From a paper:
Fe3+-enterobactin, Fe3+-azotochelin and Fe3+-protochelin coelute with PfeA on a size-exclusion column suggesting each of them are bound by PfeA. Hydrogen bonds between the catecholates and Ser479, Gly325 and Arg480 are conserved. In the azotochelin complex, a molecule of ethylene glycol from the crystallisation solution completes the coordination shell of the iron, and this molecule interacts with Gln482. However, the side chain of Gln482 is unable to form a hydrogen bond with the aliphatic backbone of azotochelin, and is slightly displaced. The carboxylate group of the backbone is pointing towards the surface of the protein in the vicinity of Arg480 and Lys218. The positioning of the three rings is clearly important in making the optimum interactions with the protein, indicating there are constraints on the linkage geometry. It is, however, worth noting that the connection of the rings tolerates the addition of at least one extra carbon, seen with protochelin and that a molecule with only two rings (azotochelin) can be efficiently bound.
The structures of pyoverdine, pyochelin, citrate and ferrichrome iron complexes bound to their respective transporters FpvA, FptA, FecA and FhuA showed that the ferric-siderophore complexes were bound inside the barrel adjacent to the plug domain, a position thought to be poised for translocation. Pseudomonas aeruginosa, a serious opportunistic pathogen, does not make enterobactin but does possess a TBTD outer-membrane protein PfeA, related to FepA, that binds and translocates Fe3+-enterobactin into the periplasm. PfeA has the same two domains (22-stranded β-barrel and N-terminal plug) common to the TBDTs.
Numbering used by the authors: 25 to 721
Amino acid sequence: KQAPGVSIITAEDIAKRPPSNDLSQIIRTMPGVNLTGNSSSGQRGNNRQIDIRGMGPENTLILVDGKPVSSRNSVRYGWRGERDSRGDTNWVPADQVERIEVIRGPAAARYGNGAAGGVVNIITKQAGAETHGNLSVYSNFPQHKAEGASERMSFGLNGPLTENLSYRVYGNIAKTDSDDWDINAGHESNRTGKQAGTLPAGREGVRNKDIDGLLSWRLTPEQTLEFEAGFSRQGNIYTGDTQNTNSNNYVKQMLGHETNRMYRETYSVTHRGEWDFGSSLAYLQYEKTRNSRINEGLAGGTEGIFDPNNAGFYTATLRDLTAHGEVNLPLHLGYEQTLTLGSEWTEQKLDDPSSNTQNTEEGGSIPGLAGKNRSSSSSARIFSLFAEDNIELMPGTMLTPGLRWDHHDIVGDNWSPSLNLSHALTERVTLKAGIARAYKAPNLYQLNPDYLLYSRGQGCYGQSTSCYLRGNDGLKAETSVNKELGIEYSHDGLVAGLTYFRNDYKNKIESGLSPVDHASGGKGDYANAAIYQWENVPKAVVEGLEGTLTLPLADGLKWSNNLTYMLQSKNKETGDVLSVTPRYTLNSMLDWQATDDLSLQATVTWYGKQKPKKYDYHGDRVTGSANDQLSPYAIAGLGGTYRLSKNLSLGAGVDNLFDKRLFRAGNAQGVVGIDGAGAATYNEPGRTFYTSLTASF
Ligand SMILES: O=C(NCCCC[C@H](NC(=O)c1cccc(O)c1O)C(=O)O)c1cccc(O)c1O
Ligand SMILES: [Fe+3]
């Protein structure tokens, strides 16, 4: 389950720590993984996503059965590096997942674009020889009614239909109620003037509907051909959340209603082949995401709040097209060694009506950018060639070099080399080392000179005058030299390991610091505003430790722990933090096999201190409640599963036994009328009982 750099979560694990709804809840308990925003603003702070080794969630590549999910790239990427997106770990329902693979650092660079943190690969249950299926129910029950309860019903059904033909289908309906609109009342940062009365919001609710079908068809002895289609829809339940925590009437009007809907449709064809030389695999995926949501503004404190002037839904469309080919070749060349070879092609088409609408009437106009009817379209294509040799040098020892080459049609050519070593020092001890250069192609918002944000001053680096931020097709890719050195003892279910990791992070893309130009014209003291672009930042660094310890106390009884310790996270230009994480995270399970039929699980997570950013959007040092830190705290849980037969199991437990609760107070920093909240940017739910039922053949 744990080795240096890599973790498997199994279906059995998912059952013993059932997630409310999204998988992030269990994925985040692996070593090296946090659940965090993408930068440090605190904006959209209850919408946290999986972060690997502090590299941010935009650098965590999500796969389903080896096939990329890109849906969140259909939500506007904002000034501060957040999208109002819940992420892409909630498309597959927990109970139909066979296993989840988390691959961190140098071992994941070979996956290419957006794996600079790592890869999470969510794998679904598949058909067997004979026909199986299940029906799964989960339902939880908050102690405090403000917080939103969750409900989940999913089914699976799999089997053969001819001797070489098989099917698997599954289907889910889920609800996670939102937190009440007022849950953070009494905990909010201090609000005066125009912003008096405003609230930072609790967790958004989400309604899920997921339906997948697969036909897998075995044309020859050594040939298999799979066709699959997926239909999912998440519609939220809105509870007041806005980028800056400000409000208007339209906001309040929408409390309790759907304000975003994400429809995700996937079709895929996959051929896997099994012959003398070795092994082929190739596929086509078409992912189409419709992001339909209420029009929002794009300027200043109006960035990311419903626009009352321009009311109604707009719809962003992401068409993502992916095709992949790989063959594997054993080579008996003195050295026993296996050799992978592969191309990849992807296209991202984005249609976005709202995001490019910000006009130039106030800050003055911008040579090269029309103030109106600018294009809705952007796109990018990456072509990719890659090869990996996995060498055996002696029994116990593998050396694994590979080279990935990527051609981005705008950004140019990228070379991501890698090397991974693992070394039996003893039958019980293994040393691992890895050093790779991973790749991040700018997203379509960063890249687009037609994408334009505006502020009167409040949000402008190094000044109080009006300014524009503009996309920049001159950008370089972000690269990162991810190093890791680790050691692990493993013998008779005793496991003890510690890994050190450092990622040197080059050309991290962020809103710029210096004006490149000044517009001309516009209104009053806001006229002739400064123009910044999205800029590559020369150097940043993350550093820390991953640990694991597993002791089998007796036969019936297993004690597990995973440790993250974050040593550093530094934008080396400005000196501020990249993400905000806990100083450490320790997850502890005790697993008692109380009878052949009963199993019992006690868990604790300890979170270290959390510190907010030091500098505001001006580059100036923050003061008062914008410095507020979160103290360390722990969350404990008991749960169990009582198997009534081969066909029927029941679960029950309590998450957060001792009711430790936290409340979003706002964003990190102060604006006019809204005192900052520092690191108190998210809501931690209180005690929550839950029950579950799984019927299966
Ligand atoms: O939250 C912010 N400011 C306090 C909320 C002001 C909301 C609202 N703002 C505007 O209408 C506005 C319009 C155009 C340009 C701006 O910079 C604005 O703040 C208002 O005027 O009351 C804020 C955050 C980042 C950047 C900014 O320029 C902000 O005003
Ligand atoms: Fe403003």
